[PDB]
RNA sequence: CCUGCGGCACGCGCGCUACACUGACGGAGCCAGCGAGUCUAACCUUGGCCGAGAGGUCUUGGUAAUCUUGUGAAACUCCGUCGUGCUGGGGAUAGAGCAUUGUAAUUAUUGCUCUUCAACGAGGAAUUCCUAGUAAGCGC
């Protein structure tokens, strides 16, 4: 599970 | 052109203060020999962490440097080198032995390389402190060395550590004491001759960090 | 009578009773000149109140200092404390006030431990 | 008995024929293989008489003998 | 009814306590002060060396703590223990005989550290109620009805025996298991001042050398 | 312009006066003086058996001078060091009594000290002179 | 091998980084325009100058 | 204070007439605050304002020149004296002790001042030099020359 | 120079000081080896590979017969 | 080696010692704090004298901020000797003599003096204590 904010960036 | 007369009588005292001490009231000198003026940290990013601006007589400022996070920076590094000399159970809590070594060590660096001892000690710490250090990663049970950069306080802390350990280990079973081998370190670390302890051991820490980045 | 001023100086468990009176310029520690202090490396730790302000200001005064308690080092921090306090409390009494604030700003910029006792009272976290 | 000098009477030869060569300290003077039929550190001693043109260093002492 | 020293705080303010060690501790007992630091909540462990008992008391009333736990030892086996309530409160020097440190056993894990229930058994004497009200206030007030670790203080045969337990409740019975230290414990003197004072009024004192010394209980 | 022995550093004084009492030659070093260890927890006899008894008298004179009177039991404790008991802890032990008693009887013959009232030993007006004398000679060593 | 110094602007909080390693937006000293998100090892604050053996890599998370 | 007796004629005559006066009112009633330079005297006396009396200190020039101009610091601690041989002696005002002697001019100094901040100091000579001093440090800041 | 030599049935190593080369003999103290070099007027810091047999037996006459050379009786082994 | 726990040759826990030159040895420099101390008796004991020392002895001060005691403690400091050799590092094991406490010292009470001069060259897997006058060194 990715930490939030990182998963913004690759999305 | 212009003169200021500030002293009006020949200042003589009933208690005789010696000829080398009355001369020492113009500039403050380390161990009454070594001037803090004309001593430049020849590497930027290390000024504000190597503190040679405020001159000192002996390397024994007993002030509190442990309380704040970065209070450790303003220790005048000659003392900060003596503090890392008393690192062994045979040596903890004996500072006057360590100060007597440095005053004997700083003489040796003069006799060999005329320049200054204290310009060499500053130039030693600029060379041996690494520029990229490698850390361990988690990686899910299979750890690889991940290379990062290093804060300039750690660059000074580990630099001072490698010199005194490098002197304490090279003078383990030799007729050469701690005082002379440390002067063999700092002169070689000033040139970066790769024949000292710390210039070698930096050149793995910057070698390993290049391999995996 | 005789103009004197008595100041104290205190490190770990060592007192320092420095009588300062107008005189000729002798500076004694325990009935012995100040050029004969024991640890011999820290002798310049007690020349600090002599050499910071300038050795001219001791030309008219006497500094009788007697110390008990402490060790070898923690007496040297007591005689450098009571000479600095004994000098800067004679210029506010029997010499000029503007001398005192020149001294109290001189010892301050060098080392504040000369004047006020750095008391290392404990802390619980 | 036999002469109270040799091997070291040769060690004298190669001594003053190599000391001016290097030179350096007593840990370095340890070289050449220092043995009896004379003495260790004393080497530098009679070597303080003349000279050479090079360095040196002391232990319990403290010097940079320009021997 | 609670004791007169503990009366103002009793349920209102949580205690904050200090577990500290005698002087240059052995590495066995410096572990064992941490089990005391874990057996209570609100407990910090300050290593003692070149402190005096005045300036460790007097720099604790200042910072404000409820009480002070100091330990002693013989050759690694801890022997003694005192609890001393600070705002001129009482002290209780305990001798503790049968100890089993937690670090001996196995790497079973780590403790629950949640607020414990307590169990005080076999305290009948009025001096026994003093030891109740001086031990009970070392725990944070008002534990939950379903907290899972319970600390028993049992008094069979004048030796207050304290164990640490966790419990879970099955379909029929409670099943328990032991974590933390086993003590036997014995108080032997009870001052009305702190452990600093050394000339305060002695409320109780274990008399050994008396014709009826072995006869009575809580004597 | 005047000197007291207190104007001369401790060692350089007992150094030049212990070499004054050897060139003086009249002291009466007692019969043994090569075999004794000097103290309680000592190990070896003095490393210089030549000039030690004169080193020690030259100490003893500078010490009773500065004081009113000091006895034999007092010179022991001043000259006793710590004794290594080996595998047992170090503790303080007084030095050898005969030695310091035989510096006192032997400094009364050259008159550097005398029996005091109240007890002990005290510096004599003559020995107060000699000590002040060499306190100047040492003072003037500056050419 | 020219080395480019960099001045620290802002330490980064709440980023999930491996302990010991902290994450810092630096600013280039020789040209005050650019920024690069690098990681430090030792203790670092703002307004101190940091040494970069390589400029163009820009360090990501270290898990 | 010293104990030796004062040197002067026993038939008391008044002080010679006063050609330069300076007064700073900041510390009045505690020591002297009026410095006057008499006509043709190598010294220059002081006066307390509150007690209405000649002060106890007299200020000498130490180069045998006549006092042509005096000034005081705004703090009322320093007393300037401008000799007629360039020398600017700065006497303190508690004890009348000498502290600093400035030497820039060669002709007669004819006016001194100290700024409000006690930092910078000016002087003007009959040689045309207007010298600008620092006073915290003893450095000469600069030097200006006019015509007359 | 002559190396390893035999004194009182004991082989004495030549390249060391006589103050210490005599101490390899059984029982004789370090200070006892320090006194005999003083009594026999021998330099302390010489090596054992020196010391001609004239000066050897004078040490031997003192060491095997102490009490005729003002040696203190406690100072024996 | 000391000690505790097991076991009954050994297993375990707390510990002390040193492996040396940031040392040892010899002089010399010389600085703590908490403390205790004698009555119907023999306490803490200066000083003198005798003994290499350990100790002996003639006296003294003190029921004590008064006398011991400035407890002149030790690491520590300086100058010197040793010179990397199980060496002068280390002091176990042991021989012989002299003292002390005690009705009593053999299975050594302890101390002193000379000789004997071992393991130990930084300690496997394990694992203890610790954040500032603290850790560790050091003596009382």
Coordinates of N, CA and C in Angstrom, one line a residue, chain F residues 29-91:
Chain F
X29 N 74.8 12.3 57.3 CA 74.0 11.2 56.8 C 74.2 9.9 57.6
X30 N 73.2 9.3 58.1 CA 73.5 8.1 59.0 C 74.1 6.9 58.3
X31 N 74.2 5.8 59.0 CA 75.0 4.7 58.6 C 74.4 3.9 57.4
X32 N 73.1 3.8 57.3 CA 72.5 3.0 56.3 C 72.4 3.7 54.9
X33 N 71.4 4.4 54.7 CA 71.2 5.5 53.7 C 71.3 4.9 52.3
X34 N 71.9 3.7 52.1 CA 71.7 3.1 50.8 C 70.7 2.0 50.7
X35 N 70.3 1.4 51.9 CA 69.4 0.2 51.9 C 68.0 0.5 52.3
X36 N 67.6 1.6 52.8 CA 66.3 1.8 53.3 C 65.4 2.3 52.1
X37 N 64.1 2.0 52.3 CA 63.1 2.3 51.2 C 62.4 3.6 51.4
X38 N 62.6 4.3 52.5 CA 62.0 5.6 53.0 C 60.6 5.6 53.4
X39 N 59.8 4.6 53.0 CA 58.3 4.7 53.3 C 57.5 3.4 53.6
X40 N 56.3 3.7 53.9 CA 55.3 2.7 54.2 C 55.0 1.7 53.0
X41 N 54.3 2.2 52.0 CA 54.0 1.5 50.8 C 54.9 1.7 49.7
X42 N 56.2 1.8 50.0 CA 57.2 2.0 49.0 C 57.6 0.7 48.3
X43 N 58.3 0.7 47.2 CA 58.7 -0.5 46.5 C 60.2 -0.6 46.5
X44 N 61.0 0.3 46.0 CA 62.4 0.4 45.8 C 63.0 1.5 46.7
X45 N 64.3 1.3 47.0 CA 65.0 2.5 47.7 C 65.2 3.6 46.7
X46 N 65.5 4.8 47.2 CA 65.6 6.0 46.3 C 66.6 5.7 45.1
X47 N 66.1 6.3 43.9 CA 66.9 6.0 42.7 C 68.2 6.7 42.7
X48 N 68.4 7.8 43.4 CA 69.7 8.5 43.7 C 70.0 8.3 45.1
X49 N 70.9 7.3 45.4 CA 71.3 7.1 46.8 C 72.3 8.1 47.3
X50 N 73.0 8.7 46.3 CA 73.9 9.8 46.5 C 73.2 11.0 47.2
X51 N 72.3 11.7 46.5 CA 71.8 12.9 46.9 C 70.4 13.0 47.4
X52 N 69.8 11.8 47.8 CA 68.4 11.8 48.3 C 68.3 12.4 49.7
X53 N 69.2 11.9 50.6 CA 69.1 12.3 52.0 C 69.2 13.8 52.2
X54 N 70.0 14.4 51.3 CA 70.2 15.9 51.2 C 69.0 16.5 50.4
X55 N 68.4 15.8 49.4 CA 67.2 16.2 48.9 C 66.1 16.3 49.9
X56 N 66.1 15.3 50.9 CA 65.0 15.3 51.9 C 65.2 16.2 53.0
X57 N 66.5 16.4 53.5 CA 66.7 17.4 54.5 C 66.4 18.8 53.9
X58 N 66.7 19.1 52.6 CA 66.4 20.3 52.0 C 64.9 20.5 51.8
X59 N 64.2 19.5 51.7 CA 62.7 19.6 51.8 C 62.3 19.9 53.2
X60 N 62.8 19.1 54.2 CA 62.4 19.2 55.6 C 62.6 20.6 56.1
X61 N 63.7 21.3 55.7 CA 64.0 22.6 56.1 C 63.1 23.6 55.5
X62 N 62.7 23.5 54.2 CA 61.8 24.4 53.7 C 60.4 24.3 54.3
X63 N 60.1 23.1 54.8 CA 58.8 22.8 55.4 C 58.6 23.3 56.8
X64 N 59.6 23.0 57.7 CA 59.5 23.5 59.1 C 59.6 25.1 59.1
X65 N 60.4 25.6 58.2 CA 60.5 27.1 58.0 C 59.1 27.7 57.9
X66 N 58.3 27.3 56.8 CA 57.0 27.9 56.6 C 56.0 27.6 57.7
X67 N 56.3 26.8 58.7 CA 55.4 26.4 59.7 C 55.9 26.8 61.1
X68 N 55.1 26.7 62.1 CA 55.5 27.0 63.4 C 56.3 25.9 63.9
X69 N 55.7 24.7 64.2 CA 56.5 23.5 64.5 C 55.8 22.3 64.0
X70 N 56.6 21.3 63.6 CA 56.1 20.0 63.0 C 56.9 18.9 63.6
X71 N 56.3 17.8 64.0 CA 57.0 16.7 64.7 C 57.4 15.6 63.7
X72 N 57.8 14.5 64.3 CA 58.3 13.4 63.5 C 57.1 12.6 62.9
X73 N 56.1 12.3 63.8 CA 54.9 11.7 63.3 C 54.3 12.5 62.1
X74 N 54.5 13.8 62.1 CA 54.0 14.6 61.0 C 54.9 14.5 59.7
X75 N 56.2 14.4 59.8 CA 57.0 14.2 58.6 C 56.7 12.9 57.9
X76 N 56.4 11.9 58.7 CA 56.0 10.6 58.1 C 54.8 10.7 57.2
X77 N 53.7 11.3 57.8 CA 52.4 11.4 57.0 C 52.6 12.2 55.8
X78 N 53.4 13.3 55.9 CA 53.7 14.1 54.7 C 54.4 13.3 53.7
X79 N 55.4 12.5 54.1 CA 56.2 11.7 53.2 C 55.7 10.3 53.0
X80 N 54.7 9.8 53.7 CA 54.1 8.6 53.3 C 53.2 8.7 52.1
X81 N 53.3 7.8 51.2 CA 52.4 7.8 50.0 C 51.4 6.7 50.1
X82 N 50.8 6.4 49.0 CA 49.9 5.2 48.9 C 50.7 3.9 48.7
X83 N 50.3 2.9 49.5 CA 51.0 1.6 49.4 C 50.1 0.7 48.5
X84 N 50.7 0.1 47.5 CA 50.0 -0.9 46.7 C 50.1 -2.2 47.5
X85 N 48.9 -2.7 47.9 CA 48.8 -4.0 48.6 C 48.6 -5.1 47.6
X86 N 49.0 -4.9 46.4 CA 48.7 -5.8 45.3 C 47.3 -5.9 44.9
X87 N 46.7 -7.1 45.1 CA 45.4 -7.6 44.7 C 44.3 -7.0 45.7
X88 N 44.8 -6.1 46.6 CA 43.9 -5.5 47.6 C 44.0 -4.0 47.3
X89 N 43.0 -3.2 47.8 CA 42.9 -1.8 47.5 C 44.1 -1.0 48.1
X90 N 44.4 0.1 47.4 CA 45.4 1.0 47.9 C 45.0 1.8 49.1
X91 N 45.8 2.1 50.1 CA 45.5 3.0 51.2 C 46.8 3.7 51.6

